[PDB]
């Protein structure tokens, strides 16, 4: 998912003067893919640690990939 | 920030999480927004040097390589 209107606002917040629709669609896809990969790693960290609930520390460690 | 939290908690559940803390949802939204801003900042520089003010998909797809 990720809805594309908030993604276009992220690009504006970085200073973009004009934003094409395809740039919004592309950045939504990139952030979904990264989100999925970080989440996947975080579920495994948790399981390797012996845990069912995903915590912030799981996300923070997974992000360093 | 700009990202809504509901879709981000669904990303974690759909990755296999049994349970997700609220702090974890917020952490993941903050990480993705920051990564998004850094990619977009670089995309803006790529477009300016191509002589454009409009950000294109190709600018995002090149800038994302900063995180490979």
UniProtKB/Swiss-Prot annotation, chain A:
It comes from the Archaea. Gene3D superfamilies: Histone, subunit A. Keywords: Chromosome, Cytoplasm, DNA-binding. Residues 18-20, 52-55 are annotated as: Interaction with DNA. Pfam families: CBFD_NFYB_HMF. GO terms for cellular component: chromosome; cytoplasm. Its main location: cytoplasm. Transmembrane segments: none annotated. Induction: Expressed at constant, high levels during exponential growth and during stationary phase. The record marks 12 as: Interaction with DNA. It is found in: Cytoplasm; Chromosome. GO terms for molecular function: double-stranded DNA binding; protein heterodimerization activity; protein homodimerization activity. Binds and compacts DNA (95 to 150 base pairs) to form nucleosome-like structures that contain positive DNA supercoils. Increases the resistance of DNA to thermal denaturation. This is DNA-binding protein HMf-1. It comes from Methanothermus fervidus.
């Amino acid at each position: 998912e990720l809805p594309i209107a908030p993604i276009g606002r992220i690009i504006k917040n970085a200073g973009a003067e004009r934003v094409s629709d395809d740039a919004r669609i592309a950045l939504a896809k990139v952030l979904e893919e990264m989100g999925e990969e970080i989440a996947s790693e975080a579920v495994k960290l948790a399981k390797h640690a012996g845990r069912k609930t995903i915590k912030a520390e799981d996300i923070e460690l997974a992000r360093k990939m």
